[PDB]
């Protein structure tokens, strides 16, 4: 399937134990896609002071379209030292590994895979 319905646990930035997916744009996009498939991917909602508490490169989910079955269509865009790899809509949040942190909410998304 080109798209997969996912429900992503929304984590508070200060709870997050593993604050990024790796060390290159290509690795973080790779790791993010693997964790999304394995159901081991969390979402942090981006506000003032969140991104400096996480590790670059960042992986964002961005709205790819204006929402089947409640699931917002999203795609992945990475960022490293102010350069983005991908072009998409509004940020829904930053992806991080989920290692059992308690979420505050779930974000229903349709991921272009």
Curated annotation (Swiss-Prot):
Compartments (UniProt record): Host cytoplasm
Domain called CoV Nsp1 globular: residue spans: 2-113
Region (Disordered): 1-113
Chain's role: Inhibits host translation by associating with the open head conformation of the 40S subunit. The C-terminus binds to and obstructs ribosomal mRNA entry tunnel. Thereby inhibits antiviral response triggered by innate immunity or interferons. The nsp1-40S ribosome complex further induces an endonucleolytic cleavage near the 5'UTR of host mRNAs, targeting them for degradation. This inhibits the integrated stress response (ISR) in the infected cell by preventing EIF2S1/eIF2-alpha phosphorylation upstream of stress granule formation and depletes host G3BP1.
Protein name: Host translation inhibitor nsp1
Organism annotation: Severe acute respiratory syndrome coronavirus 2 (2019-nCoV)
Shown residues in whole-protein numbering: 11 to 125 of 7096
